[PDB]
RNA sequence: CCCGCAGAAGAAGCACCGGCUAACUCCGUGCCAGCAGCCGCGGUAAUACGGAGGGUGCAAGCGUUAAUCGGAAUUACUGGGCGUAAAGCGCACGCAGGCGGUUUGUUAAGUCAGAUGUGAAAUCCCCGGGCUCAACCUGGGAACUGCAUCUGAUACUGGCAAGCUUGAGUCUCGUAGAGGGGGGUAGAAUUCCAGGUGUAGCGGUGAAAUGCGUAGAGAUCUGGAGGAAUACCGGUGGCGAAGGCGGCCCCCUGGACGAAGACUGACGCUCAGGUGCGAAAGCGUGGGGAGCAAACAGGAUUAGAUACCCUGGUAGUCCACGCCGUAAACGAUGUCGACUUGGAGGUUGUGCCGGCGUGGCUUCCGGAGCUAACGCGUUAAGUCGACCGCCUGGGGAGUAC
RNA sequence: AAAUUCUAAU
């Protein structure tokens with residue numbers, strides 16, 4: 091429907107890992123989804139790794 | 142990320158903010174500055 | 190059933206098996222913890238329940254629930270377990286007695302202290 | 311097959327009462343006559359009569375008081391598949407004594423009060439109330 | 440045990456407050472931390488989590504855990520069910536076993552009544568007594584529902600002897616029927632083989648294509664071969680224990696019913712284990728093979744099509760013998776017997792004068808009654824009796840050993 | 841004559 095089941099990208103620059111290394115783990119989102127007939131609020135999660 | 146309330150909360154350092162829209166447009170620096178502030182504060186302590 | 194059909198073969202009562210078979214008709218048992226971990230409940234509940242795996246003195250290997258808020262248990266701690274189950278956890282049917290051998294009572298507790306091994310201040 | 315005459319008599323009486331018949335006819339015997347005599351003496355039926363010489367017939371005349379059955383219930387107790395004998399101290403009371411229970415003692419067929427006044431037990435034929 | 444001294448002086452906790460279940464507000468957190476016997480609470484305005492105030496129940500105790508009975512009529516002797524919620528064996532015969540129409544006489548085994556012996560003490564229950572009361576101790580009784588012996592009663596059950604005819608069976612005459620086993624024969628049609636006429640299509644589909652045809656098809660006419668099934672009659676019509684049985688004819692053979700009379704004299708009903716029959720598919724041996732058609736091949740449709748549709752097509756379907764033993768084998772309703780308002784039909788016998796009756800099987804509606812309701816309703820799922828089979832939450836599973 | 845699907849908080 092929308093975004094990605096799994097997107098992996100390579101970031102090149104200075105001090106990239108010194109700033110982005112705290113983004114690993116899980117991120118939770120609570121909202122009214124676009125794929126919802128009713129107005130029900132739903133909770134979902136995404137998983138992020140930095141290498 | 143709570144969209145109905147427009148809030149973003151971080152559970153590692155227990156910090157909540159009401160600037161979700163600025164975060165989702167790419168200004169997440171204010172989220173990662175405090176964490177490092179805590180993190181580095183432990184690097185000098187672990188000298189024993 | 191006809192009286193003759195009952196004379197030939199009487200009524201048979203159900204076995205009525207027990208749901209705490211590791212205690213063997215005892216109120217409490219002593220065991221050693223071999224692993225301490227956290228699991229997740231069934232639908233619709235959501236949490237991080239605190240459980241442990243314990244080997245008893247009669248040769249059994251069971252899973253116990255650690256109630257309260259905050260515990261000091263780690264591996265190789267002798268604990269005292271009792272009957273009673275946790276509803277939304279799959280396969281947990283024993284409880285850990287707080288205030289027992291090597292598990293301290295919940296701190297800062299002020300109500301229902303006797304159920305958590307807390308002395309009266 | 312035909313293995314119990316007494317509850318056949320009882321069922322005929324019951325079905326006659328339920329269907330508002332004026333009289334019920336059946337083949338006869340001696341125990342049937344004794345039970346009918348007890349019923350007539352205790353005010354449950356009007357009269358009875360046996361007739362014939364080779365194949366006797368027993369006929370009972372049923373009664374209704376306020377346009378309804380007098381025999382509210384009549385049931386068998388001691389059946390061929392299970393017999394019931396009671397001592398003189400264990401004789402039953404039907405409807406706390408309002409109804410009657412027919413017994414057969416060594417002196418003949420009678421009620422439970424007549425059996426207690428004779429100090430006897432016997433076989434419990436039926437409960438009629 | 441009693442008396443004197445001083446002073447309220449030495450002495451209250453535990454669980455619970457959403458419903459079941461007696462007893463509510465504020466703050467903190469925000470599907471986190473946590474609660475929980477079952478429903479279930481917590482997602483930023485929680486009487487359900489943690490704390491505080493208040494309140495409720497017990498009280499030198501209060502809660503939790505373990506174990507037993509109850510509630511549970513949820514193994515139903517007292518005191519349950521089986522058409523559709525779990526539950527009637529696919530059907531039948533039948534040994535052991537359970538049950539038994541009617542009358543007379545005898546017996547006293549079951550049964551009933553009385554008496555005697557025993558049923559240890561303690562325990563439970565009742566009237567008293569002693570510890571200041573109670574717990575506790577103790578006097579007398581009642582009870583210990585049981586067993587054995589002796590004497591009596593004969594209504595019911597059982598034994599023995601003699602009976603009786605209504606249950607059950609035999610005989611005389613007849614009626615109807617796709618009931619079963621064996622053999623023969625007839626007609627229509629499809630297929631194949633040979634020949635005559637005749638010429639460009641046929642077949643199939645929603646539309647097409649594969650396929651057959653100028654080597655003469657399809658159409659049409661004549662003769663022959665072979666196999667399988669029997670149009671019309673034909674009908675909620677008939678026969679059979681069930682599974683099932685359909686052209687005509689002969690031989691062998693089982694049961695049902697009807698009218699009058701005669702005969703035996705309870706010879707009866709049900710049935711665990713046992714035995715026998717039991718659609719279709721399937722298996723072995725030997726035949727047979729027209730039509731149809733699992734598998735298989737090709738042509739289509741489709742995003743795909745190991746399918747539905749089209750063209751072919753092998754086991755099988757058929758016969759003889761032998762296994763298999765299963766079906767939504769269903770009326771989802773075990774067999775036997777008695778009783779209880781009516782109406783409209785079908786089929787098959789018989790008596791009296793088209794009318795009047797009287798038996799067997801069968802279809803539809805409906806009254807009381809019964810049922811959770813739907814519905815059943817003299818062919819009961821109504822009221823009773825005898826015997827058998829079966830059920831005890833849903834998955835796992837009619838599965839593993 | 842054709843024609844597949846609709847997760848997870850009311």
Ligand SMILES: [Mg+2]
Pocket residue numbers: none
């Ligand atoms: Mg209340």
Ligand SMILES: [Mg+2]
Pocket residue numbers: none
């Ligand atoms: Mg609580």
Ligand SMILES: [Mg+2]
Pocket residue numbers: 485
């Ligand atoms: Mg709040």
Ligand SMILES: [Mg+2]
Pocket residue numbers: 511
């Ligand atoms: Mg019970």
Ligand SMILES: [Mg+2]
Pocket residue numbers: none
């Ligand atoms: Mg119980």
Ligand SMILES: [Mg+2]
Pocket residue numbers: 190515
């Ligand atoms: Mg019963």
Ligand SMILES: [Mg+2]
Pocket residue numbers: 519520
């Ligand atoms: Mg029941």
Ligand SMILES: [Mg+2]
Pocket residue numbers: none
């Ligand atoms: Mg059923």
Ligand SMILES: [Mg+2]
Pocket residue numbers: none
């Ligand atoms: Mg049947």
Ligand SMILES: [Mg+2]
Pocket residue numbers: none
């Ligand atoms: Mg017999």
Ligand SMILES: [Mg+2]
Pocket residue numbers: none
């Ligand atoms: Mg006998």
Ligand SMILES: [Mg+2]
Pocket residue numbers: 547
């Ligand atoms: Mg005797």
Ligand SMILES: [Mg+2]
Pocket residue numbers: none
């Ligand atoms: Mg006696």
Ligand SMILES: [Mg+2]
Pocket residue numbers: none
């Ligand atoms: Mg005693």
Ligand SMILES: [Mg+2]
Pocket residue numbers: none
């Ligand atoms: Mg006799």
Ligand SMILES: [Mg+2]
Pocket residue numbers: 616
């Ligand atoms: Mg015939």
